[PDB]
Every structure is written in C-alpha cells, then in structure tokens.
Curated annotation (Swiss-Prot), chain B:
Brain, mostly in frontal cortex. Expressed at high level in fetal cerebellum. Residues 1-98 are annotated as: Binds and tubulates liposomes. It is found in: Cytoplasm; Membrane; Early endosome; Presynapse. Residues 1-17 are annotated as: Disordered. GO terms for cellular component: cell projection; clathrin-coated endocytic vesicle membrane; cytoplasm; cytosol; early endosome; glutamatergic synapse; Golgi membrane; perinuclear region of cytoplasm. This is Endophilin-A1. An N-terminal amphipathic helix, the BAR domain and a second amphipathic helix inserted into helix 1 of the BAR domain (N-BAR domain) induce membrane curvature and bind curved membranes. The BAR domain dimer forms a rigid crescent shaped bundle of helices with the pair of second amphipathic helices protruding towards the membrane-binding surface. Residues 158-224 form a coiled coil. Belongs to the endophilin family. GO terms for molecular function: identical protein binding; lipid binding.
Length: 231, 224
C-alpha cells in the first residue's frame, strides 16, 4: 500500500489487459501472414491450373496472346478433314468435331481472361498492397505498445510514484492502442468475407465455362450420332 | 484376232486404268488417314496434358495441386474466420474436379488414342502394304500380257482365260478393299464420337461439382 494510482495503471498497461492487447495484435498479424502466403500460392496454382503449358502460361501472366490446346487440336482435325475429302464420313466428321474443339477453345479463352481479371489480379493487389500495409502497421503498433509499456515500468522503478497527469496520459495512449487493434480486427473481418467473395468469382467463372462446354459437346454429339446412322 | 484384242482392251485399256486408279485412290486415302491419326492423336494428348513434363504416361493433375494449396491454407487459417473454411470447401471441389479430369484422361486414352495408335501401327500399315503389292502385281500382269501379245500376235484361248481370271481376282480384291475402308471410315467416326462422349461426361460432372460449391459459398457469404 503505497503509490496507489501508479500501481493501478501499472496493473493494467502491464497486467492482464496489457497482455491481451498484445496477443490480439499478434493474433491479427498471424492471420495476415497466413492470408498473404495463402493468396500468393493459390494465385500461382490457379495460373498453372489454367495454363499447365509453361509457354502459354508465361503469356497469360502478361495480360489472350497465345493459342489454346483446343485450338491446336481443332486445326489438326480441320486440316486433315479437308485433305480426306467428302467422299467419306471421317473427313466431314473431323470438320464437325474440329469446329467444336475451336468452340471449346474460345470458351477456354474466356475462362482464362475472367479468372485473370476477377480473381488473379485482385489477389495480387491484395497481396502486394493491402496485406503488406496492414502487416507493417500491426508490427509498428505492436512495437509502440511494447515501448510505452517498458518506459512506464522503468519510470515506475525510478520515481516510484508517477504523477496523476502523466498516468492518465499513459492510460489514454494505451486506450488509443486498444482502439487501433479493434479497428484492425473489424477491418479484417470485412476482408475475410471479401476473400470468400473472390473465391466465388473463381468458381462462378469455372461453372460458366463448363456449362458452355456441355452445350457445345451435346450438340456435336447429335451431329455425330446422325452422321453415323446416315453414313 | 478379236479374242486376243478384247482381252488386251480390258487389261491394257479403260477398265485396266480404272482398276489401277481405284487402287491408287485407296492408297491415297490410307496415307492421309495414317498421317491424320498420328497428328490428331498427338494434339489430343497435348490437349489432355498441356504441360510437356507430364505427357509421359499419356505427375498430379493441376487441379489436384490447387486443391492441395487451398486445403493446406484452408486449415492453417482456422475455423474461426470464413475464408479458412471457404478454402476448404472450394479445395474439396477442386479435388473432385481432379478426380473427373483423371477419368477424362483415362477414357480418352482408352477409347480414342490407343484405338488410333493401333489402327496406325497395324491396320493402316497392313492395308497400305497390301495395296502396294496388288498394285505391282496388277501392273506386272498387264505388261506380261502385253508382251505375250506382241511376242505371238494371237494368244491361245486358255491363256486368255487365265489373263481374265487374274484380272478378276484383283478387281474383286479392290472391291473388298473398298468395303474394308468403308467399315474403317465409319469406325473412325465412332472413335471421334467416343472422344466427344468422354469430354461431355467430364464437363457434365464438372458442372454438378461446381453447382454444389456455388451454393455453399452463396450461403456462407449470406450468413457472414
Ligand atoms: Ca468378277
């Protein structure tokens, strides 16, 4: 029982509240780091999924200015379909499937372009800017919090008693930090849901792509069944 | 020497040249079909596995590595947020797409590529060789007959009969070859049909998988 007010302030800034605020800031900087590494690797695996072919992939990241494997298959079928002639059914059949392959090629183009713009680019920005700036901030605030905490303890050690006016200042600053962490927490809650939204952009793009592959393939399927039946 | 002249006009005339052309046409069709199958088989393989380092068998599917990456980070984030579990949901969706892709590669390989390779290495190669053979034999007899005619003017009725018999054999052999190629022609169209069917089943299964994940994320975003 001595230096009462000083001990209460020391009890908070360096007690429970203090440690909790420090973990909160640490907790958030962890989630940001994970999100950052995640977004980066998922971005890379997505591109590789869109264009497993390295030559065409390098061009994708440029943005399409490259040919789709489907288009190359289409060309092969159409070229030889022509050389075979219409004196048979395989010749014209290669032209019907070759056309479909070229059609698949175009929807594949749209899939690459849409994922590139509505999923890859956004994550690249999220990673290079937003997450990078938030991370530095968390660390910067985490350092200050630790600094003022030490200065306070060291001061209490020297003077024993810290004036009432300086105590409240220390309390105001600690409080300002509690607000900053809370403001970051909510900001992160919003980012968290926006990230799920970006994932939708990816999934929605694939669905549309495949939906169109189906329409294209169901059709050419009819053309072939009929061709065989009518040989 | 009417008799001798009638045979000569057949074997060394229009009908002879028609048969000869019929053989050369099928030969042509075989060469083209042979080269076409090789090229189409190759582009199909490159379409199934665009990444060259992984065309050997035809490594893990690109879809599978993506699913891996999402699940790993999906769990490193935790179940407190929404992104972590979301990645888990979409991750599983990617793995299921990897399963379906696997099937595509397997079914296209089995019902399109191998049949084509077989056709190119066996069937087309045998027919091609047989066509060369009958073609040379056909010309060989046409010449032999022509020089026999020059050598003796009038050719014995029995030798005329043999000449006509051999010519008929080849004429029928060509008729057989024509039909054999007709069989193959429609067979090849069936192979393309098998290719399309496999792709169609793949994309259909992909649609269903994606429709599911779509609803799950739709809901998750709503309850956020
Ligand atoms: Ca006959």
């Amino acid at each position: 029982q001595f230096h009462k007010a000083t001990q209460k302030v020391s009890e908070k800034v360096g007690g429970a509240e203090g440690t909790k605020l420090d973990d909160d800031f640490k907790e958030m900087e962890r989630k940001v780091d994970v999100t950052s590494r995640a977004v980066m690797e998922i971005m890379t695996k997505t591109i590789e999924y869109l264009q497993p072919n390295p030559a065409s992939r390098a061009k994708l990241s440029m943005i399409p200015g490259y040919p789709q494997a489907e288009a190359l298959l289409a060309e092969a079928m159409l070229k030889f379909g022509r050389e075979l002639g219409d004196d048979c059914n395989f010749g014209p059949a290669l032209g019907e499937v070759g056309e479909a392959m070229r059609e698949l090629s175009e929807v594949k183009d749209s899939l690459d372009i849409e994922v590139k713009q509505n999923f890859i680019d956004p994550l690249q920005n999220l990673h290079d800017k937003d997450l990078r700036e938030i991370q530095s901030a968390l660390q910067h605030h985490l350092k200050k919090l630790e600094g003022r905490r030490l200065d306070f303890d060291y001061k209490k050690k020297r003077q024993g008693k810290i004036p009432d006016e300086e105590l409240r200042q220390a309390l105001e600053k600690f409080d300002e930090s509690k607000e900053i962490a809370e403001s970051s927490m909510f900001n992160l809650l919003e980012m968290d849901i926006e990230q799920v939204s970006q994932l939708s952009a990816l999934v929605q793009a694939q669905l549309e792509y495949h939906k169109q592959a189906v329409q294209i393939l169901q059709q050419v399927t009819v053309r072939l069944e009929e061709r065989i039946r009518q040989a």
